[PDB]
Structures are given as C-alpha cells and as structure tokens.
Design a protein around this nucleic acid. Structure first.
Ligand SMILES: Nc1nc2c(ncn2[C@H]2C[C@H](O)[C@@H](COP(=O)(O)OP(=O)(O)OP(=O)(O)O)O2)c(=O)[nH]1
Ligand SMILES: [Mn+2]
Ligand SMILES: [Mn+2]
Length: 174
DNA sequence: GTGAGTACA
DNA sequence: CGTTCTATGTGTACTCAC
DNA sequence: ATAGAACG
C-alpha cells in the first residue's frame, strides 16, 4: 500500500516517461492524453494501486499500445497485458507497487473515465438504475437492446447529467 | 481456432 | 404507516477442452 | 437511485 502523496509523486514522474515501441522507433505517449483514475482521481487518503487510462487516437494502434509499452528510466515487471488492460509492478524507491493501465479511444473518453474512477460500489449502484430502464453502460458506451445510444456530450459531467444523475466530484462519489 | 469456466476487477 | 436495512454489474485477459 | 421487505 502507498499514500495519495506517494501516488501523486509516482504518477507525475511517469508522465514524462511513457511511450510505446511501434515497430522500431518508439512513439512518445503525450501526457495531455493520459488521465489518473480510480482511487487517485477520487483523492482517497490511502492507495492500493495506481490505475491509469490512456487515450489512443486511432483504433489500429491498440494492437501495439499496451503490450509494447515502456516507462523510461525505471524498472518494472509485467504480470498481464492486452489491447485494453495491462497490469504492471514497479520498483519505486525501495518500493514495489502495482500499476494498472487501461485504454480507450477519444470517442470513449468520459465513459472510460466514469467507468474507471469507481468506486466499485458506485458502479454497482448506478448500473442497476438503467438496467431497470433497459439500457447498458460500459467502458465504451451507452446502449439499448443491442444498439448504441449516442449523446451530444464531451465531458464526464455532461454524461452523468445526460444520463440524468447527480454530478459530484470524485472525492465523495458513492 | 470456436467456446465454457475463472480471475480480477 | 415511517425508518431502516438490503440488493443491485459486466468486461478483459487468461485457461483448458475440442 | 430505487424499490421491496423487516421492524417499530
Ligand atoms: N475493485 C473493483 N473495481 C472495479 C470493478 N469494476 C469496475 N471497477 C473499476 C472501478 C475502480 O475504481 C477501477 C480500478 O479499481 P481498483 O481495483 O484499482 O481500486 P480503486 O481504484 O477503486 O482503489 P484501490 O486500488 O483499491 O485503492 O476499476 C470491480 O468489480 N471491483
Ligand atoms: Mn486503484
Ligand atoms: Mn486497479
């Protein structure tokens, strides 16, 4: 375990140091395209792991953008990886800590953040509401009866509100 | 080289 | 009848027949 | 959020 002060330090260092190797020359992951989520974005006092959400700008880099990932100048061991979820352990200070990573394309941004900030209890509650209205909300979208439901939205609030729910900051999300 | 059961969110 | 407790979801990456 | 069930 590690604190929000530790986490904040760790996430800030990484945002200089991320990139993936796309067939030789490695293309630099721009930090305006990475977003701290889960506990750290809710600003909980104590952290179990740092969970991060990378936004890809074309679909056909998902084949590359997590299983060929590098963090400059620091050690790590991989336990799992895929196109959209990739879990890593880090060596920080003398510390070993765990780092989840997650991807969505820009079309998906707020829903990935809303899904990934948690908390777990909030996600469990919030969904039942719309299953009662026979809708489905996921990392990627909002859908009904097998067809996506498009909305005129850009940020997470406009999503939560377009869904018809109290918007609140991630500290006390429940 | 399609398809159920599990692990971990 | 009011207060309170409780239940509630679903995708990714993996494994292991076939 | 939301509704049903257990309890005064
Ligand atoms: N724990 C958990 N998280 C889930 C689940 N489903 C979706 N999530 C989302 C919400 C979480 O905020 C996000 C990552 O959660 P984590 O497992 O890393 O923990 P979280 O960030 O909530 O805080 P933590 O790492 O426990 O200190 O994934 C689930 O079933 N369990
Ligand atoms: Mn976390
Ligand atoms: Mn996590």
């Amino acid at each position: 375990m590690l604190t929000l002060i530790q986490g904040k330090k760790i996430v800030n260092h990484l945002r200089s140091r991320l990139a993936f190797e796309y067939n030789g020359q490695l293309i630099k992951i721009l930090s305006k395209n990475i977003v701290a989520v889960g506990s750290l974005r809710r600003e909980e006092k104590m952290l179990n792991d740092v969970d991060l959400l990378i936004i890809v700008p074309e679909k056909k880099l998902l084949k590359h953008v997590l299983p060929n990932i590098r963090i400059k100048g620091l050690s790590f061991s991989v336990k799992v990886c895929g196109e959209r979820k990739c879990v890593l352990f880090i060596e920080w200070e003398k510390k070993t800590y765990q780092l989840d990573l997650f991807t969505a394309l820009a079309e998906e941004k707020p829903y990935a953040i809303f899904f990934f900030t948690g908390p777990v209890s909030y996600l469990i509650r919030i969904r039942a509401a719309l299953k009662k209205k026979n809708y489905k909300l996921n990392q990627y979208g909002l859908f009904k009866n097998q067809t996506l439901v498009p909305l005129k939205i850009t940020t997470e609030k406009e999503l939560i509100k377009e869904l018809g729910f109290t918007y609140r900051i991630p500290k006390k999300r429940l």
